[PDB]
Symmetry: C3
Subunit: 149 residues, 3 copies
């Protein structure tokens, strides 16, 4: 019994792992995930940057980061409104970095942005035009998470 039941449960476990992978694939498909493309998702809720980060972290994803013009448009279409991007200059003013680490490679700043306006702006939002504007991390904008291709 013992060894047999143990061997059976290993098979039951592997079977459940396969089924759950399948469920995840179907869910990504249903949410618009395109072959070989990373995918962005939103619950359409607007909140402070720190809350977006914590929320995407729970889902094992990251705050949406467009690495090129295609991903930038993709994020725009998903959000439908202003949304925080996974980019800030919180560590060194004027120097924007990805929350996943590293200096910017692609950017689509609105004219004369980023400007750290008034009391200060260390976060970034993609606006209803695809362009970027640095804004207060305390302001509430749409939460858009990103998952791997």
């Amino acid at each position: 019994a013992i060894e047999v039941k143990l061997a059976n449960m290993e098979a039951e476990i592997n079977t459940l792992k396969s089924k759950l992978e399948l469920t995840n694939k179907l869910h990504a498909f249903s949410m618009g995930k395109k072959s070989g493309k990373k995918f962005f998702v939103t619950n359409h809720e607007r909140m402070p940057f720190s809350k977006v980060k914590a929320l995407c972290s729970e889902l094992r994803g990251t705050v949406a980061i467009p690495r090129n013009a295609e991903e930038n448009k993709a994020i725009q279409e998903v959000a439908k409104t202003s949304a925080f991007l996974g980019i800030t200059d919180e560590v060194t003013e004027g120097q924007f970095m990805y929350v996943t680490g590293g200096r910017l490679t692609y950017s689509n700043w609105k004219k004369d942005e980023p400007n750290d306006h008034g009391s200060g702006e260390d976060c970034v939002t993609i606006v209803d035009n695809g362009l970027w504007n640095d804004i207060s991390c305390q302001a509430s904008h749409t939460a858009v998470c990103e998952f791997p291709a």
Copy 2:
């Protein structure tokens, strides 16, 4: 060996349980669930109240119940059309109670409602503009389920 294999499998099971909970979270998020708010969802199918209760129960949820104006609006946006709410006055006429227990607190009745029209109306539907109208439990309306915050 045996004790080690069993321990390693108990660890795989724990990881799998966490992954499934993550799948449930991502799904709810993708379907619009707001932080600290109940999750309302519909398949857009109209059916009698008895069936809506059976369906939500099978999904381990319950028929949608608006506890306040905010939830009422959230349910309205999800339903899109007339939908049953988890409220009835089957016990004492005029005394509406939640299907999960307790007396009705918040309400958003339409002018001249509830009227227990004709042979009687002991169920409730959220209709145009989010107002409420009591209706026969045998009539078919949209099935909207709620899941905890």
Copy 3:
């Protein structure tokens, strides 16, 4: 006690099987599955027929097949654009068969179709008004999968 841990493991696994089944039911419900009806899903991606077949098969479904007018309307709403159906006359020119086996019965051909136009057309797309047109399997149309009732 080895046997006590094994019995708990069995209970943990069964609880997980039940919870995954509920997650799948809730997802299908959230995607619009009507009671006792098969349901359709699309990621809105356009690709050649062989890829759509591969994708749906990997998700344990099949390329969508309208068996009647209701299902045809349901597929049309989901697709929003031209989409391949699980119907072809690849095996014997002129005789359309379901990819899962059997001769085509219900059909919704546009006037003057199917016509195996030019070098040939062995696949089928649901297009404008939900009518059908036979087209080259190499063309790229929206991927729509169907899952059992």
